Nucleic acid binder design. Structure first.
Length: 226
DNA sequence: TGGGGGCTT
DNA sequence: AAAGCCCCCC
């Protein structure tokens, strides 16, 4: 934690770790990560304490801090890094897409990736429509399952802004994936979109090839209506 | 299947 | 802030 802010945060988090909570938190993530055992309320308070002391670092340092936290072993530091990224949301723009790509493909799991994609990337592509073709096809073809999940979920919260043709194209490109988290992402985005346009999702699921898992996930809340 | 402490609003 | 939702999990 070269940067003083990251050092303080690490010291403060470590001083407040809870071994009894570490185990179940770690199991939730299929043991891919060590945990300190600090849940979100306390994790955010501990971040608040440090901000109260140091003040939020200048925007020129924000990528440095986030990377340094990403390199720390315990998962809470990546969670804290995302809390921090949210506080800098107004300074995050299209020039940061490569930075966000690195975050997605490093220490990858659903918890970090879902926290990056629908909000930060979703907003970026809304403001910069021309960049969709520069990133989405590349992510789909990358064979990195987390970039693939990113391509599927960037429109997750769009509601009526959903580009249906694009969504169905992206899903079509990944419908044969044998990856659990891709099949789940397809199910999720379809299920979420069905809150807005259930008819189109129902017809899509009935008439197109998807894993049974994705079909089950997609229709779990609307099947009682058909 | 379909619903649940941890999270959100 | 009482109450709904659930990425995920099983």
């Amino acid at each position: 934690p070269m940067h003083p802010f990251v050092k303080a945060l690490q010291e403060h988090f470590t001083a407040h770790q809870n071994p009894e909570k570490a185990e179940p938190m770690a199991r939730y993530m299929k043991n891919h990560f060590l945990f300190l055992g600090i849940q979100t309320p306390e994790r955010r308070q501990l971040l608040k304490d440090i901000i109260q002391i140091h003040t939020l670092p200048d925007q020129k340092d924000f990528q440095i801090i986030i990377r340094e936290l990403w390199d720390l072993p315990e998962r809470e530091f990546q969670a804290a890094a995302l809390d921090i990224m949210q506080k800098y949301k107004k300074h995050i723009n299209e020039t940061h897409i490569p930075f966000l790509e690195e975050l997605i493909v490093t220490k990858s799991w659903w918890d970090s990736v879902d926290s990056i994609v629908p909000t930060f990337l979703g907003d970026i592509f809304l403001k910069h429509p021309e960049l969709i073709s520069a990133y989405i096809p590349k992510w789909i073809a990358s064979d990195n399952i987390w970039l693939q999940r990113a391509a599927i979920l960037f429109q997750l919260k769009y509601k009526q802004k959903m580009d249906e043709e694009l969504l169905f194209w992206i899903i079509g490109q990944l419908h044969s994936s044998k990856e659990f988290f891709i099949q789940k992402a397809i199910g999720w985005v379809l299920r979420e979109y069905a809150k807005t346009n259930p008819d189109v999702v129902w017809e899509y699921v009935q008439n197109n090839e998807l894993a049974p898992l994705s079909k089950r996930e997609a229709i779990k809340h609307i099947k009682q209506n058909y």
